[model samples]
Target: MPGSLSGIIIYVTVAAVVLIVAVFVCKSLLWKKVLP
Candidate 1:
């Protein structure tokens, strides 16, 4: 973990984790409403 590289890696990781959880939550919501 260098200086700026570490920062970029952490940013990307957080972004991806957020995106994944967002998609999962969105899909679950749709399943309860639209799928019903």
Candidate 2:
């Protein structure tokens, strides 16, 4: 058995990382415009 569970975990981790970066980069860009 190749311990297939890690593949799911890795996929989830990559998704979460993309989500986090998307969330933060969006807010970061918005904040720059909103700031003086």
Candidate 3:
């Protein structure tokens, strides 16, 4: 059984990672369109 704190930590970490990847992908696409 996972503890409450551990579950919260896992959720937060996954959210942060997803957010970072999304931002990175968006930036890459925007730059590709603008610079080309």
Candidate 4:
């Protein structure tokens, strides 16, 4: 991690991680076919 870009790097990294996890969780829950 470089000094100047460290903040931007972490911000994007965590944002991507959360997005990935959210999609994964939603898919897992939808696998039950609870929707009509």
The best candidate by TM-score is: 1
Model 4's number of clashes is 0
Model 4 agreement with the true structure over 1-36: per-residue lDDT tens digits: 436777788798789879978988987887876754
**TM-score, candidate number 2:** 0.44
Q: Rank the candidates by TM-score, best first.
A: 1, 3, 4, 2
Residue 30 in model 1: lDDT: 80
Clashes per candidate (backbone, < 3 Å): 0, 0, 0, 0
Give lDDT tens digits, candidate 3, residues 1-36: 655886777798788878978988988987895774
1-36 per-residue lDDT for model 1 (tens digits): 345866787798788878978988988888885685
**What value does the lDDT take at residue 8 in candidate 3?**
78
Using all chains and alpha carbons, the TM-scores for the candidates as numbered come to: 0.48, 0.44, 0.47, 0.46
Give, for candidate 3, the lowest lDDT window spanning 10 residues.
1-10
- Whole-model lDDT per candidate: 0.79, 0.80, 0.80, 0.79
Which 10-residue window in model 1 sums to the lowest lDDT? 1-10
Q: Weakest 10 consecutive residues, lDDT, candidate 2?
A: 27-36
